[model samples]
Target: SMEQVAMELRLTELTRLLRSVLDQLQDKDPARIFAQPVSLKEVPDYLDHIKHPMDFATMRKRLEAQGYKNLHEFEEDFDLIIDNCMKYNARDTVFYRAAVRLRDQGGVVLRQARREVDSIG
Candidate 1:
């Protein structure tokens, strides 16, 4: 079942989902104010990753006690740290959930709630 077509289909679905989210964002007033000028496909996926597992209450508290204040800061910091990692290579449910948890609490801190992701690594 590891066919090339299946892989392409998977990529296509990912692109479609990302684009759909981006389209929804494009309509927002703040999307026009950003400096990064995100692509229709890129923004949504980036946002999707922000919803990682570590950002949640249980995880966030633990992380905060260790040093980090919130997942928003962690995501922004984590993004820089993981920039060398491959695209979507680090993507996963754990990362999505973590980012979301962080975003939920650090929503004001990071200023972006859509990029929530869970952290497995």
Candidate 2:
């Protein structure tokens, strides 16, 4: 009857959304940048610059809380990762470039879905 119109399946969609993005973040070796938390040692003073760090690992943990608010709160956590890199790295750097693509992609993955599934593959 389509009665479940406002279907609370938002929980499933959000989690599914997260999983989709995480998969792309690990697409290849370059995926390394988005998968784990940045190292304090490698980029010394990283903390000095980035007050609150966000990464795929952190996002997955949020997936656990399932706090629909915090779950959908994924937007903040997601943007933080993208925005932080743009702030800290110069335009020419690998991360900055990677971050750019991630922003475009993550944004879509966050709000759009049908396109990714409609492929008759």
Candidate 2 TM-score, true structure as reference: 0.68
lDDT of 2 by residue, 28-104 (tens): 32656877888888998899999999887877787766543423366678778888999999999998998888887
lDDT of each: 0.37, 0.69
Question: All candidates' TM-scores?
Answer: 0.28, 0.68
> When superposed on Cα atoms, how far off is each prediction in RMSD?
17.3, 5.6
Best by lDDT: 2
- Give lDDT tens digits, candidate 1, residues 59-96: 23333344333344544533432232223344565434
